[PDB]
Amino acid sequence: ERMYDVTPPGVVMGLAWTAMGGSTLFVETSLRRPQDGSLEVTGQLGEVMKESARIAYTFARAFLMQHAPANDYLVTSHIHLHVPEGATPKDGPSAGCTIVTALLSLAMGRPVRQNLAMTGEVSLTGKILPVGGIKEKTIAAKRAGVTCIVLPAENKKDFYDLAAFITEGLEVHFVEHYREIFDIAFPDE
Known part of the structure; x- marks a missing residue:
């Protein structure tokens, strides 16, 4: 199956691939100090992926300044972000929305x-930009019991290049902006 059967606050399921195939990954976050904030990052992340964490970090603060200006959590807290497993090298920008x-x-x-x-x-x-490995990621999500998958709008042709027996019975959302992801990830906000 996969590392988390049920995800608590601050944990989100993402997807990855190599030449060997696709896989699931979980982004983990946590306070490292009790409540000018900072972000510490671990998980053998390559340069491009570390930058995407910085971009995601700035965007998440801006997004929270709008959706809930009273919530200074990201602006003041000291957070640690990790992508297990600890020894596996990871790179690329496709986990930014994650x-x-x-x-x-x-x-x-x-x-x-x-x-x-x-x-x-x-x-x-x-903005949500297209990524690679749509086939492998989709197959790995299915195998892990994922029932709802979120993909960039410009990966739509990639998704429907797949045979129907792969894609049927999958609720899929094609998104152009992170706000659409927010509404899917957090339906009651």
């Missing part, structure tokens, strides 16, 4: 929708 979601989930004290997974690059203003 990281935004983990940070907002932690700052609101609200888990995301269960059996949900996502992949997509996020820009500084929250």
